[PDB]
RNA sequence: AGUAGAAACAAGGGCCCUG
């Protein structure tokens, strides 16, 4: 016999089995060629040849905005924009939402941008340092930038975001910058290019669209302005119903269902509806920051004169951005015994010993190129601006005209980033087609293209949106979250409760069935027992932990109160997923074991900080890597160790430093001194202290104060 | 006053607003972005074309008024120079998929499944580690009874394999699962075949002319043909294995309400049905062998080791008659060997070697990479013996994901419970056992006719599908399974008389057929999808023959 | 009344809030004294003390003290029962004329 | 003690340096927070992988050293290692160890005197457990469920507070020496603090953990979830084990957590005081504010001020709304038209004037909105989604489960939109006396027709007849509503759609600061009315327990 | 949050909030100055003290 | 100190005090009493003919 | 040799260490 599983798709639906296709049960798969092709496609998509010359860098600057040419194969992507249409659509959207809308949003944003501390830039994905020219986390990059500022002119007394932005601005006009290293200094032009510089990362953690195989990583001189723009964009998007970017899960489902009901209720008897599943292409390669600049200027027209200047920064910076070529080419001989490695800055030299493809792709991009960088004056990148593009897109679904009503035609829908859903209505197919072509045209006028292969249509109730297929019912893919049914990798106490919580959320939202949840529970339990090299007592397994387990087990009288990490069995089920085991066994443990576990004096316990879990000896912290031990990355550890000593001493004095953020007009030394004297008196009055000890402490403290104030 | 001011100051300091901004003096009442010189020079340079200074753009945007007529005119103009095609599938049907042409796709999985032969023994709880069982099986003499010959049926470098097998036997005899670095192992382990570096600072035009150092010409994979051995494996992995308990599983907790009782009952049925198959023993084999290999790679790098390919199971349960309380069993399918898994970084590669036992002669098309030897005879009566040998590699990522191969159970349970609950709700009655024993599901074709069997027996097909997805996972299969959904949605539209349409299906077919290369699973599923659309054309439109 | 809530007096069901100026044997912290203290102009002559000796001061006296973190002030054991609600509402209504 | 002297010596040594001195001298203390981030920064992509790759090692854990020496923790107990003298690179005061040592500690390690304090630390979760234990399960059945999505609370919590009120409470219960100035919330809530302090005093504990647990103990976890049946936190915490899309585990959970009683009592008190202040004619505003501040109530054991509870709850009722408005309390954008509930989804408009003749010729001004708008509506066990257009009810859809509720919702919707001829020519039955001004306070024709409907069912039937009636076309038979409220008929009303399955309640995390008039009618930056005193029951007598009306 | 007025309402009386709001609207200055003015105003009030 | 269903008893005591305050010995809500009366026996019943 | 993909590994740092 010959086998074919797809045959089940005849006598059964398709949504209730679509999960079977997703191969998320196996390992997923993992430069310069990609980047060069991307640069090429970006230039190419702009359908023009006009260029200017930057008096700053003296470089050709292709201008792609309101300069459309080469109107052939328009079905293909285009990155040219007509600002007039953009502003018209924005005006129509405002008219729909009412007056005083954009102003209200920018006001809500300014209400936060001002009070924000400049330390919230540490949170986020990696960034590109502008001194070592590598991708470090944000905290270290901020530290290094501050230290450089201080070593150049003086310490940064600022405590908010605005002062940091003004300092950055000023630093774009200096003439000599210093910074630490195994203490090199640089000039204005080099620092400028190195600041506008941008790097790439091949993380693409999520599978999602395999086309996504990279992501951007700007510097530190572009983060706050980007945050400002994203904040205003968020405050705008949240007000709209035709957007689903910030929300997640049930929200967009409810949106779609209400939209469908409204649609079915509006259309008369002589009308019929249609759906479409769209997947835009080259999203991050057609969106232009110049249109964003004009749009933000149109928005910040009635608000204060302050927001007008801030929002206008990140656009021009992305309009004058540089890209980073990574790792260069690799050379080799025939037998491949030897192998030479080369970097980007050198490819301009050995451009003859490369494949003809690289030559055809590289020589054209030799004028836009500088040392290991290319001057991309436009385009965009992944993750940089998602919400703003979503706003720009939603402006289309709001369109309306006299022709659409002369035929009784109108469209609506719902759009997220590069993924939308359309609902067209008309009285005949000849008009449906015309409506769809009109929509495509209006989207083409603002660089929003559409993929003709990944996009398809059908009658109303059949579509998909972000891996969620929709019909009369709602099909939870249930494979999108399969990896979550795994031990996080934090500690023993936690992973089990976290897994149970995830299972509960699935059962609530994703309609996960009971028996499936039980199976997942048992599987996660087995994986937990296997990872930490632990097994039950009744088992016969041998090894390190199990040895002492079987040794001291005799002291116990009720194993039902034991923990899994200490040779305990499972006591939990569906009706007990919202209850950690530690709580479920507390009433049966042995006082000895109970007290030896829940003791605050543990050489292991560390706090992590959601953290819906119990604390005990099992809540440990893992060892730290040591590969850096050999690398000479030690000079940087010095300042970190200094800050750590300072912080831990301050905390030794003030125990609530972490819980309640400190505040006041005193410095650190003043508060420390005063508190120490206070405690000394408080004790010597009643507690076990002598006048000699008090006087010695006081002398030491005054001497330390003198030294502190004398050093500088 | 002082009290009020103190409270207010504390609040502000808590809100970070205790600064000149919110509490300025008379003079410092004008806060503004310190617009420098360079920033302005750029801003006046990034303006769109018609404007040349940010001031003009600001004046045009702050006063922009809507003129719907010119907008509609440009819309129509752009709508005429485009000519967007619209294609209802009913008129423009989908052609069949064009698979590549060439030789057949051979076996790729590291371990053998159908052709595998194993030696079994009884398990003692004391001796449970691998380094122990590999000796226990060694004492009885069968593992040592083997003695291949220098004449291979097929393959290459047989001398290296033979010497490696002899060294393995010697090491086992020494009670030390270790091997020395000789020329043979060095050749099979890729010890010194890592490229040598040559800086450019030390390079001249003269150095390049001596030995050509051109840019490496990447040799992308080559195409293949449809494999004819896949259906055999699929049909073999559906039958029992004479034992069960191949895949370890945890215990069932207590129950208090009907819900947990139902869940436990259904889970027990499914687990008992699945644990008896052959795919299950392969899953357990992979689990345990990969665990052992990962442990070794973590503890004993820079050292060639010896790890067995084994599994644990339990003989089936007959009636109370005869010997009750059936025993357990340790099974051994072959030997495995690693080579200096210095996993400095994820995605790395550590070459392993596989010595497996079989009793079935090979095929050149399928067992192309293997190098078989004629060993001797073994009992059951006596039968000849073969020794399949090859080389491959692994990574941290693959090891981890293969060890977590119990997800197929979850997916299958989800699908089945969904079907049963959906059928039970439409009637408001417990219809689960009936749905498992009665509801029929298409499986395949035989003699040009369709075949069906209850879901209770079709679960195995979905399980094997998931297992293979876990095994043959790659970028090719990813793209395929991502691009096939459109076809299924079009099919559904055809079933419900929904007049579907599209813009460019040919491009979709092209994209699909682009990622079909030398990966058996993609080819098999594509041929089966073609057969699906064909069989449905007898009942639906939108498909060409 | 009850030792649990030592800041209330129940008469005929009605409740009465007793101020926190002095602490008897039951009250066992500075919490019962805070409604007797208030802030005043800083005086470096007055002494600096703890939160426990704070009970041994005389009504109408001044004393320096440390509060929370990085902050020192001067307090006086004299209260002010008035609030801001009325002092603002009244003065406002006197402006709409 | 000697430790104090050691800390002083360390401070001196640290000040001897120059950089440490500069940083401890410049700026304020807040900089500490910043310094807390530049240090100890290291993450990992797939911690699961690295955890299986590390636990496969010999000593993957770190731990304190002196704590082990003092605890007499040996090494190589029974030929199995536990740790070896070394120094981690980050801490520099910790030593590598293995997981087995933890078991050693748990089995033959130092024991504390008592540990029942844990039950107080995690009281919320022990409460979950107990609430579970006091349940009586029931049979299991299979069927389809009408699961509506909405924002609700999942954590039962008493005395729900804000964050500013919680941050001080933690400090005053654990770190009193480091306490700030006394805030009003403390002076008011003294007994509460005393209670929370009596338990966590003179105990060996890690305090950060306690603070986190208290935050959880005072946080109602608000979620947007699908829901079926009654709405109570006691259920939502385990909703996962009560029913899904296809199954239901029946169970009675009514007699636990005594929550909604407090809310209904609060609303009753609000209604009472609102009526009282309405008795006035020129100062009902100040009268109401005085009645508020002159009142208190008991919660469990403690006595709380009314104005304090009102600003913490989220009961969207036409009574609570008024109070929260008088006290300047911000609130959500939720409407109220009589008993029904409403929420605007989109659209706009502006007021407009019109008149109607009551009997013969008696001109009476009534307003409406001149634009298209869309509204969600929720009455008892019934939902609706409709649109108004220039004094007309354009369309409406319903997903309820009752005929009576359906009809009442439809009628109140028609009224809210001034749709029909009655608003063009009122009926003879009404007169100038029923018009308005019980004692001078006018009444718009809207609430007039409202009470006219609530009076007799036949007024409601006539009002429904005011809506167009036609013959049920084929196919739409299922999506049709008769006069009785039947899912199908031969002749049904005009522009109506029915369906099985409630409507998904919208959501918006917005707040607005509104005001009100001397007649107790709130406005929201527009001529729209969100609440009044005509949308609540007329009056009723109740005996309030554990309350204090300290006002003449 | 979401506006300086709501913030000022946290520790100030809404009356002075509205007052300072109308004032800044009169002078048409940046509404971030609602706070200072309210404080000054409230001080004046608590000065008069009946 | 020792008991099984304390919450029911406590809420019932509060309801008792409330009722006495209202001068009527009656209790309207039937949630706790129903439970504590049905703990002995409470279930559905299927007709034999439907078997 | 081999892996896998549209580039990387087939140890790396100073005789010693390390994931």
UniProtKB/Swiss-Prot annotation, chain A:
Signal peptide: none annotated. It catalyses: RNA(n) + a ribonucleoside 5'-triphosphate = RNA(n+1) + diphosphate. Keywords: Eukaryotic host gene expression shutoff by virus, Eukaryotic host transcription shutoff by virus, Host cytoplasm, Host gene expression shutoff by virus, Host nucleus, Host-virus interaction, Inhibition of host RNA polymerase II by virus, Nucleotide-binding, Nucleotidyltransferase, Phosphoprotein, RNA-directed RNA polymerase, Transferase, Viral RNA replication, Viral transcription. Residues 260-456 form the RdRp catalytic domain. PROSITE patterns: RDRP_SSRNA_NEG_SEG. One of its GO terms (biological process) is DNA-templated transcription. Residues 223-230 are annotated as: Promoter-binding site. Its EC number is 2.7.7.48. GO terms for cellular component: host cell cytoplasm; host cell nucleus. It is found in: Host nucleus; Host cytoplasm. Coiled coil: none annotated. Phosphorylated by host PRKCA. It is an enzyme of class 2 (transferase). One of its GO terms (molecular function) is nucleotide binding. InterPro entries: RNA-dir_pol_NSvirus, RNA_pol_PB1_influenza. HAMAP family: INFV_RDRP. Influenza RNA polymerase is composed of three subunits: PB1, PB2 and PA. Interacts (via N-terminus) with PA (via C-terminus). Interacts (via C-terminus) with PB2 (via N-terminus); this interaction is essential for transcription initiation. RNA-dependent RNA polymerase which is responsible for replication and transcription of virus RNA segments. The transcription of viral mRNAs occurs by a unique mechanism called cap-snatching. 5' methylated caps of cellular mRNAs are cleaved after 10-13 nucleotides by PA. In turn, these short capped RNAs are used as primers by PB1 for transcription of viral mRNAs. During virus replication, PB1 initiates RNA synthesis and copy vRNA into complementary RNA (cRNA) which in turn serves as a template for the production of more vRNAs. Belongs to the influenza viruses polymerase PB1 family. This is RNA-directed RNA polymerase catalytic subunit. It comes from Influenza C virus (strain C/Johannesburg/1/1966).
Curated annotation (Swiss-Prot), chain B:
It comes from the Viruses. One of its GO terms (molecular function) is RNA binding. GO terms for biological process: cap snatching; DNA-templated transcription; symbiont-mediated suppression of host gene expression; symbiont-mediated suppression of host mRNA transcription via inhibition of RNA polymerase II activity; viral RNA genome replication; viral translational frameshifting. Keywords: Cap snatching, Endonuclease, Eukaryotic host gene expression shutoff by virus, Eukaryotic host transcription shutoff by virus, Host cytoplasm, Host gene expression shutoff by virus, Host nucleus, Host-virus interaction, Hydrolase, Inhibition of host RNA polymerase II by virus, Manganese, Metal-binding, Nuclease, Phosphoprotein. Phosphorylated on serines and threonines by host kinases, including human casein kinase II. One of its GO terms (cellular component) is host cell cytoplasm. Its main location: host cell. A motif (Nuclear localization signal 2 (NLS2)) lies at residues 14-76. Its cofactor is Mn(2+). It is found in: Host cytoplasm; Host nucleus. Its EC number is 3.1.-.-. Influenza RNA polymerase is composed of three subunits: PB1, PB2 and PA. Interacts (via C-terminus) with PB1 (via N-terminus). Plays an essential role in viral RNA transcription and replication by forming the heterotrimeric polymerase complex together with PB1 and PB2 subunits. The complex transcribes viral mRNAs by using a unique mechanism called cap-snatching. It consists in the hijacking and cleavage of host capped pre-mRNAs. These short capped RNAs are then used as primers for viral mRNAs. The PB2 subunit is responsible for the binding of the 5' cap of cellular pre-mRNAs which are subsequently cleaved after 10-13 nucleotides by the PA subunit that carries the endonuclease activity. Belongs to the influenza viruses PA family. This is Polymerase acidic protein.
UniProtKB/Swiss-Prot annotation, chain D:
GO terms for biological process: 7-methylguanosine mRNA capping; cap snatching; DNA-templated transcription; symbiont-mediated suppression of host gene expression; symbiont-mediated suppression of host mRNA transcription via inhibition of RNA polymerase II activity; viral RNA genome replication. The keyword Ribosomal protein does not apply. It is found in: Virion; Host nucleus. The keyword Ribosomal protein does not apply. Keywords: Cap snatching, Eukaryotic host gene expression shutoff by virus, Eukaryotic host transcription shutoff by virus, Host gene expression shutoff by virus, Host nucleus, Host-virus interaction, Inhibition of host RNA polymerase II by virus, mRNA capping, mRNA processing, Viral transcription, Virion. One of its GO terms (molecular function) is RNA binding. One of its GO terms (cellular component) is host cell nucleus. Signal peptide: none annotated. Plays an essential role in transcription initiation and cap-stealing mechanism, in which cellular capped pre-mRNAs are used to generate primers for viral transcription. Recognizes and binds a wide range of cap structures of target pre-RNAs which are subsequently cleaved after 10-13 nucleotides by the viral protein PA. Plays a role in the initiation of the viral genome replication and modulates the activity of the ribonucleoprotein (RNP) complex. Influenza RNA polymerase is composed of three subunits: PB1, PB2 and PA. Interacts (via N-terminus) with PB1 (via C-terminus). Interacts with nucleoprotein NP (via N-terminus). Interacts with host ANP32A (via C-terminus); this interaction promotes viral RNA synthesis. Belongs to the influenza viruses PB2 family. This is Polymerase basic protein 2. It comes from Influenza C virus (strain C/Johannesburg/1/1966). The chain holds residues 1 to 552 of 774 of the full protein.
């Amino acid at each position: 016999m010959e086998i074919n599983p797809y045959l089940m798709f005849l006598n059964n639906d398709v949504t209730s089995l679509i999960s079977t296709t997703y191969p998320y049960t196996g390992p997923p798969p993992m430069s310069t060629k990609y980047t060069l092709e991307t640069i090429k496609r970006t230039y190419d998509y702009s359908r023009t040849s006009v260029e200017k010359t930057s008096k700053v860098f003296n470089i050709p600057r292709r201008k792609f905005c309101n300069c459309l040419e080469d109107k052939d194969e328009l079905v293909k992507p285009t990155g040219n924009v007509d600002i007039s249409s953009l502003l018209g659509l924005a005006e129509m959207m405002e008219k729909r939402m009412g007056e005083g809308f954009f102003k209200h949003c920018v006001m809500e944003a300014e209400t936060e941008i001002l009070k924000m501390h400049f330390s919230r830039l540490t949170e986020g994905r990696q960034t590109y340092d502008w001194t070592s020219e590598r991708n470090m986390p944000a905290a270290t990059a901020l530290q290094l930038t501050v230290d450089a500022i201080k070593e150049t002119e003086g310490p940064f007394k600022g405590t908010t975001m605005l002062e940091y932005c003004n300092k950055m601005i000023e630093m774009l006009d200096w003439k000599e910058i210093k910074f630490k290293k195994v203490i090199d200094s640089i000039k204005h032009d080099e620092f400028l290019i190195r600041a506008l510089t941008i790097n790439t990362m091949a993380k693409d953690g999520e599978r999602g669209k395999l086309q996504r195989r990279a992501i951007a990583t700007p510097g530190m001189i572009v983060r706050p302005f980007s945050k400002i723009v994203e904040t205003v964009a968020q405050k705008i998007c949240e007000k709209l119903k035709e957007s689903g970017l910030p929300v997640g899960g049930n929200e967009k489902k409810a949106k779609l269902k209400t939209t469908v009901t409204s649609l079915n209720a509006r259309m008369n008897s002589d009308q019929f509806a249609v759906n479409i599943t769209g997947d835009n292409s080259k999203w991050n390669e057609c969106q232009q920051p110049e249109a964003y600049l004009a749009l933000l200027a149109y928005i910040t027209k009635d608000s204060s004169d302050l927001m007008k200047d801030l929002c206008s920064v990140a656009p021009v910076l992305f309009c004058n951005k540089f890209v980073k070529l990574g790792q260069g080419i690799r050379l080799s001989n025939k037998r491949k015994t030897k192998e030479v490695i080369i970097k980007a800055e050198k490819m301009g030299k050995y451009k003859n010993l490369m494949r003809e493809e690289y030559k055809n792709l590289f020589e054209p991009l030799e004028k836009y190129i500088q040392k290991d960088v290319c001057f991309l004056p436009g385009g965009m990148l992944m993750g940089m601006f998602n919400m703003l593009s979503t706003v720009l897109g939603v402006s289309t679904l709001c369109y309306m005209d006299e022709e659409l009503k002369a035929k009784g035609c109108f469209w609506t829908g719902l759009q997220s980033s590069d993924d939308f859903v359309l609902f067209a209505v008309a009285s005949n197919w000849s008009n449906i087609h015309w409506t769809i072509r009109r929509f495509n045209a209006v989207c083409k006028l603002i660089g929003i293209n559409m993929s003709l292969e990944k996009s398809y249509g059908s009658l109303p109730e059949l579509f998909e949106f972000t891996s969620m297929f929709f019909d009369g019912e709602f099909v939870s893919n249930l494979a999108m979250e399969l990896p979550a049914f795994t031990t996080a990798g934090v500690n023993e106490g936690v992973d089990f409760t976290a897994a149970m919580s995830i299972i509960k959320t699935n059962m609530i939202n994703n309609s996960l069935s009971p028996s499936t949840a039980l199976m997942a529970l048992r599987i996660c339990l087995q994986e937990f027992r296997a990872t930490y090299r632990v097994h039950p007592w009744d088992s016969r397994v041998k090894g390190g932990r199990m040895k002492i387990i079987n040794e001291f087990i005799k002291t116990i009288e009720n194993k039902d109160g034991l923990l899994i990490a200490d040779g305990g069995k499972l006591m939990n089920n569906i009706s007990t997923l919202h209850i950690p085991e530690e709580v479920l066994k507390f009433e049966k443990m042995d006082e000895q074991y109970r007290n030896r576990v829940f003791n605050p004096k543990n050489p292991f316990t560390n706090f992590d900080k959601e953290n819906e879990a119990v604390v005990s000896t099992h809540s440990f912290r893992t060892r730290a890597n040591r590969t850096l031990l050999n690398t000479d990355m030690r000079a940087m550890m010095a300042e970190e160790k200094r800050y750590q000593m300072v912080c831990d001493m301050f905390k030794s004095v003030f125990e609530s430093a972490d819980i309640n953020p400190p505040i006041g007009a005193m410095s650190i030394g003043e508060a420390i001194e005063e508190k120490l004297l206070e405690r000394a008196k408080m004790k010597r009055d009643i507690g076990a202290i002598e006048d000699s000890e008090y006087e010695e402490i006081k002398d030491i403290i005054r001497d330390a104060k003198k030294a502190r104030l004398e050093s500088r | 006053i002082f009290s009020f001011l103190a409270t207010a100051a504390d609040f502000l300091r808590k809100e970070n607003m205790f600064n000149e901004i919110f509490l300025p003096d008379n003079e410092e009442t004008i806060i503004e972005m310190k617009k420098g010189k360079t920033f302005l020079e750029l801003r006046d340079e990034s303006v769109p074309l018609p404007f040349q200074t940010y001031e003009q753009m600001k004046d045009y945007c702050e006063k922009f008024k809507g003129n719907p007529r010119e907008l509609a005119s440009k819309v129509s103009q752009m709508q005429s120079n485009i000519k967007l095609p619209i294609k209802h599938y009913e008129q423009n049907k989908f052609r069949q998929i064009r698979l590549p042409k060439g030789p057949m796709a051979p076996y790729t999985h590291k371990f053998l499944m159908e052709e595998a032969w194993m030696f079994t023994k009884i398990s003692d709880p004391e001796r449970s580690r691998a380094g122990e069982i590999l000796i226990d099986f060694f004492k009885k003499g069968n593992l040592s009874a083997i003695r291949p010959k220098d004449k291979p049926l097929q393959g290459k470098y047989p001398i290296h394999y033979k010497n490696l097998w002899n060294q393995i036997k010697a090491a086992i005899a020494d009670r030390t699962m270790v091997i020395n670095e000789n020329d043979h192992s060095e050749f099979l382990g890729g010890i010194g075949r890592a490229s040598k570096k040559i800086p450019e600072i030390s390079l001249t035009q003269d150095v390049i002319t001596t030995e050509g150092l051109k840019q490496s010409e990447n040799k992308l994979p080559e195409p293949r043909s449809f494999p004819r051995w896949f259906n055999a494996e699929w049909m073999w992995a559906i039958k029992d294995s004479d034992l069960t308990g191949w895949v370890p599983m945890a215990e069932y907790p207590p129950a208090d309400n009907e819900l947990e009782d139902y869940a436990e009952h259904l889970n027990k049925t499914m687990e008992g049905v699945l644990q008896g198959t052959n795919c299950a023993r392969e899953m357990g084999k992979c689990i345990l062998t990969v665990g052992a290999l990962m442990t070794e790679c973590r503890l004993f790098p820079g050292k060639i080791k010896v790890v067995p390919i084994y599994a644990r199971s339990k003989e089936r349960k007959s009636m109370q008659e005869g010997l009750p309380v059936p025993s357990e069993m340790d099974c051994l399918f072959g030997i495995c060997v690693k080579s200096k898994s210095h996993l400095n970084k994820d995605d790395g590669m550590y070459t392993i070697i596989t010595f497996e036992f079989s009793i079935r002669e090979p095929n050149l098309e399928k067992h192309q990479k293997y190098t078989v030897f004629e060993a001797g005879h073994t009992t059951v009566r006596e039968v000849p013996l073969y020794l399949y040998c090859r080389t491959t590699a692994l990574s941290k990522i693959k090891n981890d994901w293969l060890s977590k191969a119990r997800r197929c159970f979850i997916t299958t349970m989800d699908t089945v419970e969904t079907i049963c609950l959906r059928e039970s709700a439409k009637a408001e009655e417990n219809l689960v056992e009936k749905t498992l024993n009665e509801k029929q599901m298409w499986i395949g074709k035989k003699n040009g006719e369709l075949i069906a069997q209850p879901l209770r027996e079709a679960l195995r097909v979905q399980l094997v599908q998931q297992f293979y997805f876990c095994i043959y996972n790659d970028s090719q299969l990813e793209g395929f399974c991502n691009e096939q959904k459109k076809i299924l949605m079009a099919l559904e539209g055809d079933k419900k008389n929904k007049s579907s349409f599209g813009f460019n299906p040919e491009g979709l077919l092209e994209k699909i057929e682009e990622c079909l290369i030398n990966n058996p699973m993609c080819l098999f599923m594509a041929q089966r999808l073609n057969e699906l659309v064909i069989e449905a054309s007898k009942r639906g439109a939108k498909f060409f023959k | 009344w009850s030792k649990a809530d030592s800041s209330k007096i129940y008469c005929h069901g009605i409740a009465i809030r007793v101020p926190l100026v002095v602490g008897d044997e039951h009250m066992d912290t500075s919490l019962a004294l805070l409604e007797g203290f208030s802030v005043c102009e800083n005086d470096p002559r007055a002494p600096m003390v703890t939160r426990q000796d704070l009970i041994d001061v005389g009504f109408g006296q001044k004393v320096r003290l440390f509060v929370g973190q990085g902050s020192v002030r001067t307090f006086k054991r004299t209260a002010s029962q008035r609030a801001a609600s009325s002092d603002v509402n009244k003065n406002v209504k006197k402006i709409k004329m | 003690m000697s430790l104090l002297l050691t800390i002083a010596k360390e401070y001196k040594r640290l000040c001897q340096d120059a950089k440490a001195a500069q940083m401890m001298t410049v700026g304020t203390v807040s900089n500490y927070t910043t310094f807390k981030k530049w240090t100890t920064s290291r993450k990992e992509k797939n911690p699961s992988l690295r955890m299986r790759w590390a636990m496969s090692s010999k000593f993957p854990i770190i731990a304190n050293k002196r704590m082990l020496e003092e605890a007499q923790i040996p090494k190589e107990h029974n030929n199995v290692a536990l740790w070896e003298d070394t120094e981690d690179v980050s801490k520099r005061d910790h030593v590598l160890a293995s997981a087995s040592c933890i078991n050693y500690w748990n089995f033959c390690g130092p024991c504390v005197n008592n540990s029942e304090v844990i039950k107080e630390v995690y009281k919320s979760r022990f409460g979950r457990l107990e609430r579970r234990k006091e349940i009586m399960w029931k049979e299991l059945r299979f069927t389809l469920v009408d699961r509506q999505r909405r924002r609700v609370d999942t954590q039962p919590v008493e005395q729900r507070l804000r964050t500013g009120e919680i941050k001080d409470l933690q400090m005053w219960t654990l770190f009193e020496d480091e306490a700030p100035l006394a805030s009003k919330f403390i002076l008011d809530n003294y007994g509460l603090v005393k209670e929370m302090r009596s338990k966590f005093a003179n105990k060996p504990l890690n305090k950060e953990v306690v603070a986190h647990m208290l935050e959880k103990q005072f946080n109602p976890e608000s979620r947007f979830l699908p829901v079926f049946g009654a709405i109570r936190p006691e259920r939502m915490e385990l909703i996962h084990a009560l029913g899904g899309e296809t199954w239901i585990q029946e169970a009675n959970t009514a007699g636990i957590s005594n929550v909604d009683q407090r809310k209904n009592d609060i609303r009753a008190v609000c209604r009472k005081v609102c009526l009282a202040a309405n008795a006035s004619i020129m100062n009902a505003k100040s009268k109401l504010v005085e009645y508020i501040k002159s009142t208190s109530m008991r919660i469990g054991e403690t006595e709380r001020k009314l104005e304090e509870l009102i600003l913490e709850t989220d009961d969207v009722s036409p009574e609570v709304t008024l109070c929260k408005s008088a006290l300047g309390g911000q609130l959500g954008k939720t409407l109220s038209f009589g008993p029904m509930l409403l929420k605007k989804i989109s659209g706009s408009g502006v007021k407009v004037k019109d008149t109607v003749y009551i009997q013969g010729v008696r001109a009476v001004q009534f307003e409406y909105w001149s634009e298209q708008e869309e509204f969600y509506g929720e009455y008892k066990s019934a939902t609706a989604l409709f649109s108004r257009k220039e004094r007309s009810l354009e369309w409406i859809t319903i997903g309820g489960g009752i005929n009576e509720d359906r009809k009442r919702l439809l009628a109140m919707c028609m009224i809210f939109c001034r749709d029909g001829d009655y608003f063009k020519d009122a009926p003879a039955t009404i007169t100038m006396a029923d018009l308005s001004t019980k004692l001078g306070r006018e009444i718009p024709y809207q609430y007039v027709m409202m009470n006219w409907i609530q009076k007799s069912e036949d007024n409601l039937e006539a009002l429904l007849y005011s809506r167009g009636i036609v013959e049920t076309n084929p196919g739409k038979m299922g999506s049709s509503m008769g006069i009785d409220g039947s899912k199908r008929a031969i002749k049904s009303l005009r522009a109506v759609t029915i369906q099985s399955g409630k409507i998904d309640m919208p959501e918006s995390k917005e707040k607005i600061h509104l005001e009100l008039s001397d007649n107790l009618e709130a406005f929201d930056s527009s001529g729209r009315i969100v609440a009044t005193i005509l949308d609540l029951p007329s009056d009723k007598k109740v005996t309030f327990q554990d309350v204090s009306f300290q006002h003449p | 949050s979401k506006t300086f007025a709501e913030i000022a309402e946290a520790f100030l009386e809404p009356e002075a909030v509205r007052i300072a709001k109308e004032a800044v609207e009169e002078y048409g200055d940046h509404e971030r100055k609602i706070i200072q003015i309210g404080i000054h105003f409230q001080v004046c009030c608590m000065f008069c003290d009946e």
